[PDB]
Design a protein around this ligand. Structure first.
Ligand code: CA
Length: 261
């Protein structure tokens, strides 16, 4: 079996995967954490019985393009909002092949993971919300697994891409433009939000404790995680939560994939 921290790819066009360790962690946010929102409790411990892999980066534009070429799929255009349009998977801002894939809805992510699974003979899927927070924290209990930038009160521009140019980028940055966390994972605290599988809940009362996704038979809203290029760093904290309708897409939502070992 592959040791935690091992980085591998199942094919040339496939996302770079990193093995996360089995173990437990505390999910959610302490009451007094700066910026904490009300849906980030209760704090509750979640257990991953087995190691599993996630993409160390958000899936890239070039990686998505490889899928589009292989399958012939055309992604639907997105929501009205002048200057922020998604057209067949492409945002309006300049987007090179190592910037994150965006302008995909929830089902598009599932389709990409199904294609990857068939091509590789491995089991690819969406991350669960718990897996995503686990991977973001990499053992850390506070809002960030890295220190604040020296010289300002609450700046993370040395570690993440958030609103404005102080981090080098107005829009998204190539994946891996900042240091990784202790699990070998990049961009968990900025760049783009990410789809995860879970249906939306306004709290963690009754949340699953085994690393699974918290599903409902019918869901108008699903969870998204992380924080995007246009948002302030107060929402980059590891425990920040948000949601979208699964048919939504935007130039600010991308995704990771996970792989069973
Ligand atoms: Ca920025």
């Amino acid at each position: 079996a592959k040791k935690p921290g091992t980085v591998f790819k199942d094919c040339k066009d496939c996302p770079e995967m990193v093995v996360l360790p089995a173990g437990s962690f505390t999910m959610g946010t302490p009451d007094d954490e700066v910026g904490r929102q009300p849906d980030e409790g209760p704090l509750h411990d979640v257990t991953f019985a087995k190691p599993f892999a996630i993409s160390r980066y958000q899936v890239t534009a070039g990686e998505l393009d490889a899928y589009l070429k292989a399958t012939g799929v055309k992604l639907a255009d997105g929501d009205t909002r002048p200057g922020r349009e998604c057209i067949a998977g492409k945002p309006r801002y300049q987007q090179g092949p190592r910037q994150p894939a965006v302008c995909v809805d929830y089902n598009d992510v599932k389709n990409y993971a199904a294609w990857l699974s068939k091509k590789t003979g491995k089991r690819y899927r969406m991350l669960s919300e718990a897996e995503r927070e686990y991977g973001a924290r990499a053992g850390s209990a506070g809002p960030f697994p890295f220190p604040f930038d020296e010289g300002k009160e609450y700046s993370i521009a040395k570690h993440a891409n958030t609103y404005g140019a102080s981090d080098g980028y107005n829009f998204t940055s190539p994946v891996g433009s900042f240091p990784p966390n202790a699990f070998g994972v990049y961009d968990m605290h900025g760049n783009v939000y990410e789809w995860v599988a879970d249906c939306w809940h306004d709290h963690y009362n009754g949340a699953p404790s085994d690393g699974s996704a918290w599903m409902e038979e019918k869901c108008e809203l699903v969870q998204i995680r992380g924080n995007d290029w246009g948002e302030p760093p107060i929402f980059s904290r590891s425990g920040n939560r948000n949601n979208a309708a699964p048919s939504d897409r935007g130039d600010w939502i991308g995704f990771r994939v996970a792989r069973e070992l």
